[PDB]
């Protein structure tokens, strides 16, 4: 369909708050069915945020709770939204392509607009887990000019992270 449930980490926004998600997904040009994942205010949980209507209640949030892992260590903990259990997060996301959460189904992953297109001028291995490693000559899309030194970038795969401004050049 409109997204690959197995690649959900590419529509996951670790830095984003509930309030920022609500604002972004609530913007007038955002189509119903647009969604993203992010961290919950609850430790070790995820939140799914979805534009489900035009006239409020426009934007809804769902706690994705992790269940109890089997004691053998040979079956990862399942996952739950409300009182529906799923073997994993991709299974959960797939399920809501064709079934509604509250008012709408998941149609398309939210994507930030491109500020500019750049290419890597040097190789970048990354320094922190928040960074986006890239190759020299690699094409990236800049999503945010955070500060003068570090910019939020997105690679061809859809993976997002910070990159040094002095390592990229307008394409």
Curated annotation (Swiss-Prot):
UniProt KW Repeat keyword: yes
GO biological process: actin cytoskeleton organization; apoptotic process; apoptotic process involved in development; cell migration; engulfment of apoptotic cell; enzyme-linked receptor protein signaling pathway; positive regulation of distal tip cell migration; positive regulation of engulfment of apoptotic cell
Keyword terms: Phagocytosis, Repeat, SH2 domain, SH3 domain
Domain SH3: 113-171
Top-level taxon in the UniProt lineage: Eukaryota
Domain SH2: 11-112
Coiled-coil features, chain-numbered ranges: none
Record's GO cellular component terms: cytoplasm; plasma membrane
Record has Repeat as a keyword: yes
Gene deletion effect: Dead cells/corpses fail to be engulfed. Defective in the migration of distal tip cells and gonad development. Actin halos are absent.
Function of the protein: Required for cell migration and engulfment of cell corpses but not for programmed cell death/apoptosis. Has a role in the migration of the 2 gonadal distal tip cells (DTCs). Plays a role in protecting dopaminergic neurons from oxidative stress-induced degeneration.
Subunit text: Interacts with ced-5 (via C-terminus which contains a candidate SH3-binding, proline-rich region). Forms a ternary complex with ced-5 and ced-12. Interacts (via SH2 domain) with src-1 (when activated and phosphorylated at 'Tyr-416').
Protein name in UniProt: Cell death abnormality protein 2
Organism: Caenorhabditis elegans
């Amino acid at each position: 369909n409109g997204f690959d449930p197995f690649e959900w980490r590419s529509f996951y926004f670790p830095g984003m708050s509930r309030e920022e998600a609500h604002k972004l997904l609530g913007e007038p040009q955002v189509s119903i069915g647009t969604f993203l994942m992010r961290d919950s205010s609850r430790p070790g949980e995820y939140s799914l945020t979805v534009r489900e209507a035009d006239e409020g209640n426009a934007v809804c949030h769902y706690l994705i709770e992790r269940g109890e892992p089997k004691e053998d260590g040979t079956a990862a903990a399942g996952v739950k939204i409300a009182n529906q259990s799923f073997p994993d997060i991709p299974a959960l996301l797939n399920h809501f392509k064709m079934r509604v959460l509250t008012e709408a189904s998941l149609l398309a992953a939210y994507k930030k607009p491109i500020i500019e297109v750049v290419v890597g001028t040097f190789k970048f291995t990354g320094e922190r887990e928040t960074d986006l490693p890239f190759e020299q000559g690699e094409r990236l899309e800049i999503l945010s000019k955070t500060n003068q030194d570090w910019w939020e970038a997105r690679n061809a795969l859809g993976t997002t992270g910070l990159v040094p401004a002095n390592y990229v050049q307008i394409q």
